[PDB]
Each structure stands twice: as C-alpha cells, then as structure tokens.
Amino acid sequence: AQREKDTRISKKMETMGIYFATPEWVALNGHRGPSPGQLKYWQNTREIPDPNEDYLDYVHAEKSRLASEEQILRAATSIYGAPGQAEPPQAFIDEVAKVYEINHGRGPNQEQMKDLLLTAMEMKH
C-alpha cells in the first residue's frame, strides 16, 4: 500500500520526463511527488533535488528556456534558409548549438543572428 503509492506517484512523474522521481526518491520525499520548488531546481540545474528542501527561497526565472537538439535543428534550419528547407551542414548546426550554450539555453540575440546569417552565407557562397 505504501510501496504501490510510491510506485504510482513515481510512474506518473516518469511519464512526464521527470527522471529523478523514482519510487525511492518519492519515499524519501514522504510519499509525495516533488513540489514546484524541487521541480524548478531540477529543471534549471539537472541535479537531483534534495527530498528535504522545499526550494521556496530558490531564486529563479519563471521563463526557463532550455533547448533540445530538435529545437536547435529547427532554429538552425530556418536561419540557414536552404532551398526545399533541407537540413543544414553539421558545421552550421554546431555553431547554432554553441549559441544556445553561450546563452544558457536561450536562442540567438540580434547580434548572434547576424553572425549566424553571415556564417550560413559563407557556407553556401
């Protein structure tokens, strides 16, 4: 009854891609899934939240901005502007990916957009 409760809660969380919330983590957290604070700490940090911390004094941005590779590929693809909108060279995709790293997950600012546009063009012409 206690084991199944933890497994059930854990199963719900894993279905959501909340990978830290194992049945053991849920048990240590007092048979509850993570609070908003614990989720946000994990999201921003990708470290396992302490089952003891509520993280209600953890300072963070509401809008989170972290990109997957799928997202980076779509961004790279629309900047590159190849006919039939086919996939850009890997060298250009790497440059787009590095911009996401520089920006702690955010897409290109206006100055970086220019640099990427120039890079696309030099790789085509």
Q: Point out which residues bind a copy of itself (CB under 8 A).
A: 14, 17, 19-20, 22, 42, 44-48, 66-70, 72, 90-91, 93-95, 97-102, 104-105, 109, 111-112, 114-116, 118-119, 122-123
Strand, coil or helix: 34: coil
**Residues of 51-69 as b/e, b for ≥16 C-beta within 10 angstroms?**
beeebeeeeeeeeeeebee
Interaction with Au ion in 92-111: which residues (CB under 5 A)?
Answer: 104
Interaction with Au ion in 2-31: which residues (CB under 5 A)?
Answer: none
Taking the alpha carbons at both ends of the chain, their separation in whole angstroms is: 66
CA Rg value for the chain: 20
Our finding on whether 46 is near Au ion (CB under 5 A) is no
15 binds, among Au ion, a copy of itself, none (CB under 5 to 8 A by kind): none
